[PDB]
Symmetry: C2
Subunit: 80 residues, 2 copies
Amino acid sequence: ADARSIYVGNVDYGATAEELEAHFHGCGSVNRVTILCDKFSGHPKGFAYIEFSDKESVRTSLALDESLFRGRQIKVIPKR
Amino acid sequence: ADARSIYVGNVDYGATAEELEAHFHGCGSVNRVTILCDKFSGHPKGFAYIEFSDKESVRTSLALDESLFRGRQIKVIPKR
């Protein structure tokens, strides 16, 4: 599961799983979206895990590193 | 951390951490909100963890079991 997952940095407290899936939908079938937020107002502090159905989607999704999601650049790496 | 946490059942793919914190804000200071979704369209399938700053907020938050959040009744229990 972690081998089929990416970490997505710079995700805010207004993000939804539907929005995240929609951002990564072209990379492959998504199994689970986990959003983790440590701030709920003011400057955001959080990230997400996207778990793809197939391992191959992970490499594909790396092209979305630095993409704009909800008005800010996201960091995309394989889940550490 | 798990001793300071609740499981929140029946959370949809349109929920945000800010909305969840706002629902539980009266129970005590929140440290982290984790949203976990297995469906991103159609009938939702997901849940959340709310990690409170203080253990005492967990018992308090149990009163919000069956409360309406985003138009549906949520299930609130101490994180298993």
